[PDB]
C-alpha cells in the first residue's frame, strides 16, 4: 500500500534513476497517466488528474483465495512549494470530482509529495488532485519556471510483503527437478487451502513445495518439467504504472510584456510592407 | 557637413559596393521557401548572441556547471529569457535547416554548377548537430551527462583508431571534468569558428553563382 | 505591375551565364530596396518574435543533477536524433549501426553526383528521384516516432 | 524527455512545407517558361 | 480551445483591420 | 500527448490562414 512505501523507503518514493520504489513489490505493469494544465499562474487552485485505467468488470485473487475486486493506489510528486489546496479555496464542482481521498504527505514537511489510496477501483479510475500553486513574490526561494511532476500509480494487490515473504498473487516455480508425486488439498481450521506438492527420483529428491490458494495449477499428474517452473499459472491481473509531465509556473508580467512586444512587431512589419508598396509606386514612374 | 560619402568614395571606392548590391535581381520562381536558408542563419545569429551572453555566467566545471545554469534561470536578470531563447532557437535552427534542405532538393538547386554549395551545406549540418550535442551536456544534468557517456563511446566501435578518438573526445578513458572542459571548448570556441568558415564558403559560392534557375 | 525587369537575352555576357546554369540574378524584381530593406526585417522580426513568444510560454526546464551511478530510464537524445537513435537500437550489431549512422552524411554528399545524370529541377519531371526521396523522408519520420515508443512496439509502431 | 509541443511543431511544419513545395513545383510545371528560360 | 479561438479571431481581425484601414488612410491622403 | 496534437494541427493550419489573409490583402489592394 502507498503507506508501505513510506514505511519501507522513508526519505523518498523515487530513486536516482527516476524509478519509484513501488515497482519493487507490484511487479506487473499497466499504464498510468497524469494530466495537469500547461501553465498555472501563481497562488491558484488547479486540477491534477491521475489516471489508473483497468478493465472494470474483472476481478482478482484475494489473500485467502477468494475472488475480490481491487483497489487503486498512487504516489504523486509535485514540484517544490506545491500542495493540496486549502478546502476553503477549492471551488464546488472540484470538491465533488475529488471525493473522499486522503492526501497523505510522504513525510513531515513534504506537502508536495502525496500518497493516496487504497481506494476502490470503480469510483477511482481517475483521481482529481486540487492543488495550489506557490507564489515566488512571497516565498522567496520559489521561482517562476517549468518544473517536473512524477506519477507512480498502482492497481491490484502486490507480490511481496514488507516482511519479505511472497504473496499469493504471483506464480510459484518448483524448487528442483523430478517427477511430481502428490497433489493434496489441505485446509487447517485457520489459514485455509494449501495445495501441497513434491517431486523425485533423479538424485536425493523429496523436497516439499507448498503453494497458497488463489492461483491455478495447470501442471497435472505425472510430469517432470525441470528446475523451478510453470506449476501455477499467473493469477496477477494487477500492475504498476509511471508517468512524468511538465508544468509552467508562469508570471503574468512575463506574458503581458511578451504580448506587448509582439504587437509592436506585427505593427512594425505592416509599417514596412506599406512602405514597400509606396516604393513600387514611385518605381512604376521610372519604367515609363 | 563636408560630404561624408565623398570622403569614403575617394579612398575605398564605396560606390562599387552599392552598385554590386543594387545590380542584383530576384527572379519570379523564387518563392517564400527560398527563405528557409536566411532563417536558419537568423536562428544562428540568435544562438551567437544568447550563447555569448551565457558565457558571462556559465561555469564549465563539474562542481559549478549545474549550479550556474540554475543561477542564470533564477537570479540573473532576464537569464530565464536568454537561456530559453537559446534552447528554442537551437531547435528551430536544426529544423529550419531540414526544411532548407527539402526545398533545395525539390528545387534541384544542388545540381550542375552548385554541387560544392550542397557539399558545404552537408558540412554545416554536421557542425550544427555538433553544436546541439555539445550544448545539451553543458548543464551537467542527468540527461546531458548520460548523453556524453553514450556518444563518447560510439567511436570505440571503429577498430584501429576509435579508442584513440574517444579519448580525445572525452579527455580520458571515462567521462569526467576533462570531458566538460573539452565539450565547452568545442561548443564555445571551436564550432563557432568552423561554422563561420563554412558559412562563409556557402555564402560566397552562392553570391558568385546566384540563385538556381526556374522549374 | 509588381516591379520587374525582363532578361536582356541579347546580352552576350548574360547568355553566357544562362548557358552555364546561372544567369538568374540578372532578371526579376530588384533585390534592393524591395526585398532586402523592406521584407527582410519582416522575416527576421517574425523569426525572432516566434522564438521569444515560445521561450516565454514554454521556458527551459532544469533537470536533475548528474549521477554517475544512475542511468535514467526514459533517456532520449534530442528530436532531430530520434531516427538515428532508433536505428542504433534495432540493429543488434554495434559496429553496423554506427556505419548506418555515418552513411547519412556520406550518402547526402553523393546525391548531386548521382542525380547529375540529367539536369531537371522540377521534381515532377524527375519521377525516380522524387520517389526515393519521399520514401526516405517517410522511413525517417517512421524511425523517429519509433523512438518515442517502448523498445519492442518500436518498429511495428504498435499496429502489427 | 520528449518535448510534445516541439515535436508537433516539427511535423506540422515538415508536412506543411513538403506540401507547399510540391505544390509550387506543380504550379510551375503547368504554367512553364515565362520570359524565356 | 473555444476561448482561444475567439481571442484569436478578434486579434487578427483587429490587426487585419488596422492594415486595410491604414492602406486607404494612406492611399486617400495620397501617401501611396 | 494533446499538447502535441494542438501544435501539429496549428503549425500546419495557421500557415494556410496567413497565406489566405495575405492573398486577401493583395486583392483589396490590386496587384
Amino acid at each position: 500500500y502507498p503507506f508501505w512505501a513510506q514505511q519501507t523507503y522513508p526519505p523518498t518514493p523515487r530513486e536516482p534513476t527516476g524509478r519509484i520504489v513501488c515497482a519493487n513489490c507490484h511487479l506487473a505493469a499497466k499504464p498510468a497517466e497524469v494530466e495537469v494544465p500547461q501553465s498555472v499562474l501563481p497562488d491558484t487552485v488547479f486540477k491534477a488528474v491521475v489516471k489508473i485505467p483497468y478493465d472494470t468488470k474483472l476481478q482478482q485473487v484475494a489473500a485467502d483465495g477468494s475472488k475480490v475486486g481491487l483497489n487503486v493506489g498512487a504516489v504523486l510528486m509535485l514540484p517544490e512549494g506545491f500542495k493540496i489546496a486549502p478546502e476553503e479555496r477549492i471551488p464546488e464542482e472540484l470538491k465533488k470530482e475529488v471525493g473522499d481521498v486522503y492526501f497523505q504527505p510522504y513525510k513531515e514537511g513534504q506537502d508536495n509529495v502525496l500518497l493516496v489510496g487504497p481506494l476502490p477501483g470503480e469510483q477511482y479510475q481517475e483521481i482529481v488532485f486540487p492543488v495550489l500553486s506557490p507564489n515566488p513574490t512571497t516565498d522567496k526561494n520559489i521561482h517562476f519556471g517549468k518544473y517536473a511532476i512524477h506519477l507512480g500509480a498502482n492497481r491490484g494487490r502486490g507480490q511481496i510483503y514488507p516482511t519479505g515473504e511472497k504473496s499469493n498473487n504471483n506464480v510459484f516455480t518448483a524448487s528442483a527437478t523430478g517427477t511430481i508425486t502428490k497433489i493434496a488439498k489441505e485446509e487447517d481450521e485457520y489459514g485455509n487451502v494449501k495445495y501441497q506438492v513434491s517431486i523425485q527420483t533423479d538424485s536425493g529428491k523429496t523436497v516439499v513445495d507448498t503453494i497458497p490458494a488463489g492461483p491455478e495449477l495447470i501442471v497435472s499428474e505425472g510430469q517432470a518439467v525441470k528446475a523451478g517452473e510453470a506449476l501455477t499459472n499467473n493469477p496477477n491481473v494487477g500492475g504498476f504504472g509511471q508517468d512524468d509531465t511538465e508544468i509552467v509556473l508562469q508570471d503574468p508580467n512575463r506574458v503581458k510584456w511578451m504580448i506587448a512586444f509582439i504587437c509592436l512587431v506585427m505593427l512594425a512589419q505592416l509599417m514596412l510592407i506599406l512602405k514597400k508598396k509606396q516604393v513600387e509606386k514611385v518605381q512604376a514612374a521610372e519604367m515609363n | 557637413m563636408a560630404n561624408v560619402y565623398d570622403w569614403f568614395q575617394e579612398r575605398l571606392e564605396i560606390q562599387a559596393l552599392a552598385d554590386d548590391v543594387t545590380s542584383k535581381y530576384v527572379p519570379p520562381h523564387v518563392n517564400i521557401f527560398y527563405c528557409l536558408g536566411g532563417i536558419t542563419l537568423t536562428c544562428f545569429l540568435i544562438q551567437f548572441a544568447t550563447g555569448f551572453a551565457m558565457t558571462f555566467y556559465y561555469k564549465p566545471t563539474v562542481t559549478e556547471a549545474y549550479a550556474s545554469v540554475q543561477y542564470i534561470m533564477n537570479e540573473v536578470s532576464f537569464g530565464w529569457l536568454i537561456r530559453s531563447i537559446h534552447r528554442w532557437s537551437a531547435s528551430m535552427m536544426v529544423l529550419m535547416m531540414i526544411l532548407h534542405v527539402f526545398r533545395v532538393y525539390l528545387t534541384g538547386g544542388f545540381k550542375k554548377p552548385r554541387e560544392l554549395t550542397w557539399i558545404s551545406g552537408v558540412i554545416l549540418a554536421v557542425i550544427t548537430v555538433s553544436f546541439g550535442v555539445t550544448g545539451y551536456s553543458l548543464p551537467w544534468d542527468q540527461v546531458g551527462y548520460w548523453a556524453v557517456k553514450i556518444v563518447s563511446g560510439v567511436p570505440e566501435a571503429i577498430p584501429v583508431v576509435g579508442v584513440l578518438i574517444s579519448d580525445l573526445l572525452r579527455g580520458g578513458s571515462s567521462v569526467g571534468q576533462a570531458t566538460l572542459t573539452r565539450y565547452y571548448s568545442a561548443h564555445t570556441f571551436v564550432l563557432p569558428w568552423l561554422i563561420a568558415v563554412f558559412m562563409l564558403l556557402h555564402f560566397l559560392m552562392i553570391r558568385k553563382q546566384g540563385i538556381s534557375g526556374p522549374l | 505591375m509588381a516591379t520587374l525587369k525582363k532578361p536582356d537575352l541579347s546580352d552576350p555576357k548574360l547568355r553566357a551565364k544562362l548557358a552555364k546554369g546561372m544567369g538568374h540574378n540578372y532578371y526579376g524584381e530588384p533585390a534592393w530596396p524591395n526585398d532586402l530593406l523592406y521584407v527582410f526585417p519582416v522575416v527576421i522580426m517574425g523569426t525572432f518574435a516566434c522564438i521569444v513568444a515560445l521561450s516565454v510560454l514554454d521556458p527551459a526546464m532544469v533537470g536533475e543533477p548528474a549521477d554517475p551511478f544512475a542511468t535514467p530510464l526514459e533517456i532520449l537524445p534530442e528530436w532531430y536524433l530520434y531516427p538515428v537513435f532508433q536505428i542504433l537500437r534495432s540493429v543488434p550489431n554495434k559496429l553496423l549501426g554506427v556505419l548506418l549512422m555515418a552513411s547519412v552524411p556520406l550518402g547526402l554528399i553523393l546525391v548531386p553526383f548521382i542525380e547529375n545524370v540529367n539536369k531537371f529541377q522540377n521534381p515532377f519531371r524527375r519521377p525516380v528521384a522524387t520517389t526515393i526521396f519521399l520514401f526516405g523522408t517517410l522511413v525517417t519520420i517512421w524511425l523517429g516516432i519509433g523512438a518515442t515508443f517502448p523498445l519492442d512496439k518500436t518498429l511495428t509502431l504498435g499496429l502489427f | 524527455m520528449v518535448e510534445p509541443l516541439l515535436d508537433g511543431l516539427v511535423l506540422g511544419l515538415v508536412f506543411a512545407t513538403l506540401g507547399g513545395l510540391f505544390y509550387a513545383a506543380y504550379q510551375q510545371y503547368k504554367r512553364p517558361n515565362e520570359l524565356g528560360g | 480551445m473555444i476561448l482561444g479561438a475567439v481571442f484569436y479571431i478578434v486579434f487578427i481581425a483587429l490587426f487585419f483591420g488596422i492594415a486595410v484601414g491604414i492602406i486607404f488612410a494612406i492611399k486617400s491622403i495620397k501617401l501611396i | 500527448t494533446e499538447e502535441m496534437l494542438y501544435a501539429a494541427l496549428l503549425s500546419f493550419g495557421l500557415i494556410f490562414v496567413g497565406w489566405g489573409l495575405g492573398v486577401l490583402l493583395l486583392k483589396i489592394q490590386g496587384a
Binding site: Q38, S39, V40, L41, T44, Q250, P252, V255, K256, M258, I259, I262, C263, V265, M266, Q269, L270, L272, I273, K276 | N31, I32, C35 | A2, D35, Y38, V39, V42, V43, M45, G46, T47, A49, C50, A53, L54, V56, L57 | G20 | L3, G4, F7, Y8, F11, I12, F15 | L10, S11, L14, I15, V17, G18, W19, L21, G22, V23, L25, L26, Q29, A31
Partner: peptide, 29 residues
C-alpha cells in the same frame, strides 16, 4: 487564468501575421 491563453494566441498571431505580411509584401506564395 487566461491571460495564460491570450498568451499562446499572441504566438499564433505573429506566426500567421508574419506569413501574411510576407505574402502580401512580395505578392507572394
Amino acid at each position: 487564468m487566461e491571460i495564460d491563453v491570450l498568451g499562446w494566441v499572441a504566438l499564433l498571431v505573429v506566426f500567421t501575421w508574419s506569413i501574411a505580411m510576407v505574402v502580401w509584401g512580395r505578392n507572394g506564395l
